[PDB]
Design a protein around this ligand. Structure first.
Ligand SMILES: CC[C@H]1OC(=O)C[C@@H](O)[C@H](C)[C@@H](O[C@@H]2O[C@H](C)[C@@H](O[C@H]3C[C@@](C)(O)[C@@H](O)[C@H](C)O3)[C@H](N(C)C)[C@H]2O)[C@@H](CC=O)C[C@@H](C)C(=O)/C=C/C(C)=C/[C@@H]1CO[C@@H]1O[C@H](C)[C@@H](O)[C@@H](O)[C@H]1OC
Ligand SMILES: CC[C@H]1OC(=O)C[C@@H](O)[C@H](C)[C@@H](O[C@@H]2O[C@H](C)[C@@H](O[C@H]3C[C@@](C)(O)[C@@H](O)[C@H](C)O3)[C@H](N(C)C)[C@H]2O)[C@@H](CC=O)C[C@@H](C)C(=O)/C=C/C(C)=C/[C@@H]1CO[C@@H]1O[C@H](C)[C@@H](O)[C@@H](O)[C@H]1OC
Ligand SMILES: Nc1ncnc2c1ncn2[C@@H]1O[C@H](CSCC[C@H](N)C(=O)O)[C@@H](O)[C@H]1O
Ligand SMILES: Nc1ncnc2c1ncn2[C@@H]1O[C@H](CSCC[C@H](N)C(=O)O)[C@@H](O)[C@H]1O
Ligand SMILES: [Mg+2]
Ligand SMILES: [Mg+2]
Lengths: 250, 250
């Protein structure tokens, strides 16, 4: 193991808190608070303290995507839409740091208020799920200042981290990046997924990676297929774990 | 910031839990549970969750001592006497791993049961302190299996970590190392300090480092001075923070 490999391995174990193994919130299908290795490994629990809920398999995927882009010379920044406490974005910034990359940015996009209240404009599938109901139960609303604080604890808050606070329908169309190498979508709903595909995906470079964290949710999956059909996108959808998938843009 | 530097920096932040900032036990002069940055920085609190209580200044000192020995070709292993949850030894093993050192071992010596009960054989200063009384209050007794589990969580449990379970007066005289490059003493009492200086210090290589974690405790300081006077040791005692000192063996 080289210094870089050790750092990034430890950074994954730290943002997902395999080190101290915090309890999960009891919500959804999780009936007990105890830390379960297999659940944290696959990002299936709702950590009480950890900085990311995506788990080790999806952290490994993010590493693969960012490293492949760097190795192949795919131009552009990294954007995560839906960041919670910031752990996955912290990890992304750590990857760039490990390779001393000075000319790419990690964009951190969130409401910083949890899921939005349902309105009449919402897709019927989104209305039925009403994700907003879960905000407090899994401690989702996390302020911009809290996320910035978290980056600082790792020594990774600097000007290669830029924040996009607001609802995606508002922030994405005019977000000030020109190109993306990795687009990581983690907003769960048809609405959030369609907002980001519509307004950010056209800036994803050829050879770049589009990661759909929540593909197991029917509303998210519906947005993905509607978008791909509309644009004639046939790039193979590759499964990461029981939740996430990705494709590589050609 | 190279891979190695980033890894060791994160490792220090992780074993001391600057990342998630756990509460302290309320004991001694600490009257409130809150995490206080300045106290964790100087190793002055009693972490409820963190794997080491020595803090960042003493972790930095340990890094300096191990790196200097490696740089200067000082032969031998690393021994810590008094390891608690294992954080400082985990860090030591991480340093060797970062530099791909395959021919040195980290020895992890502890009762794995906390401070010993006082008897009439104890030095009067040890008897007056009666450190045993604090075992539960700071969660000091930590089993070998727990310490091994903690190493595993960082990916650092391998054949270059060897354990010496028992009281120092029993384990040190025949411990199966031949030479030390760094001897880190963290047992607080006159007795533990004198046991280890008596039985381990002769195996410290010239150019090696003797670290006294608890020099601020009068009983510990008494043993250090008695031992140095007896052996005619005059190497400068260099202060680290409000607790620890070290010297380099001529
Ligand atoms: C705590 C927040 C979390 O809530 C949840 O997980 C809530 C879910 O358990 C949800 C309730 C499930 O619905 C219920 O599943 C049960 C297994 C069914 O009951 C059994 C028994 C039975 C007899 O009914 C049988 O017929 C039937 C087949 O199975 C339920 N049946 C009534 C049908 C079914 O209702 C689910 C489908 C399964 O996983 C429904 C579909 C639409 C879905 O996937 C929705 C996801 C949601 C709402 C996720 C949020 C948001 O969490 C996010 O999840 C992502 C995947 C993560 O990556 C994170 O982004 C996370 O964000 C915090
Ligand atoms: C929780 C375990 C911890 O307990 C503790 O810290 C307990 C100590 O606060 C202890 C109580 C202090 O004694 C008390 O000090 C107070 C400051 C005095 O009160 C004031 C007020 C006054 C009016 O008395 C006046 O005279 C004057 C202003 O002092 C107290 N007076 C009553 C005199 C005096 O009692 C202490 C000296 C100062 O720190 C005494 C000397 C001998 C000492 O250093 C003992 C250390 C011990 C026993 C440490 C253990 C073990 O902790 C270890 O500490 C190491 C340094 C760490 O690295 C760890 O290894 C840790 O192990 C877990
Ligand atoms: N329409 C929308 N606009 C902006 N943010 C949204 C949104 N819908 C959901 N969110 C945000 O999406 C996030 C989903 S959870 C994100 C998990 C995170 N990637 C991790 O590493 O753990 C929440 O932080 C929530 O505030
Ligand atoms: N005489 C003795 N023999 C063996 N172990 C002892 C001892 N006296 C104290 N100990 C052990 O010394 C340790 C003191 S605390 C050690 C702190 C540790 N270095 C850290 O990094 O946080 C305890 O684990 C206790 O069990
Ligand atoms: Mg998700
Ligand atoms: Mg000490």
């Amino acid at each position: 193991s080289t210094g870089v490999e050790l750092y990034l391995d430890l950074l994954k174990r730290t943002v997902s808190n395999f080190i101290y193994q915090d309890a999960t919130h009891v919500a959804g299908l999780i009936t007990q608070a105890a830390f379960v290795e297999e659940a944290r490994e696959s990002g299936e629990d709702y950590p009480t303290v950890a900085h990311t809920m995506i788990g080790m398999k999806r952290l490994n995927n993010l590493q693969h995507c960012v490293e492949s882009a760097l190795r192949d010379g795919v131009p552009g920044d990294v954007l995560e839409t839906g960041v919670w406490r910031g752990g996955a974005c912290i990890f992304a910034r750590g990857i760039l740091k490990a390779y001393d990359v000075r000319d790419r940015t990690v964009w951190v996009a969130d409401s910083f208020q949890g899921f939005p209240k349902i309105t009449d404009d919402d897709h019927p599938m989104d209305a039925e799920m009403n994700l907003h109901q879960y905000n407090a139960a899994v401690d989702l609303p996390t302020s911009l200042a809290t996320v910035q604080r978290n980056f600082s604890r790792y020594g990774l808050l600097d000007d290669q981290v830029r924040f996009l606070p607001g609802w995606f329908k508002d922030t994405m169309p005019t977000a000030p990046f020109e190109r993306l190498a990795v687009l990581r979508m983690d907003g769960d709903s048809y609405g959030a997924t369609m907002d980001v595909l519509t307004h950010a995906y056209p800036r994803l470079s050829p050879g770049g990676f589009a990661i759909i964290d929540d593909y197991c949710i029917p509303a998210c999956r519906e947005a993905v297929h509607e978008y791909r059909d509309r644009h004639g996108i046939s790039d193979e959808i590759v499964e990461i774990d029981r939740q996430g998938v990705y494709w590589r843009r050609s």
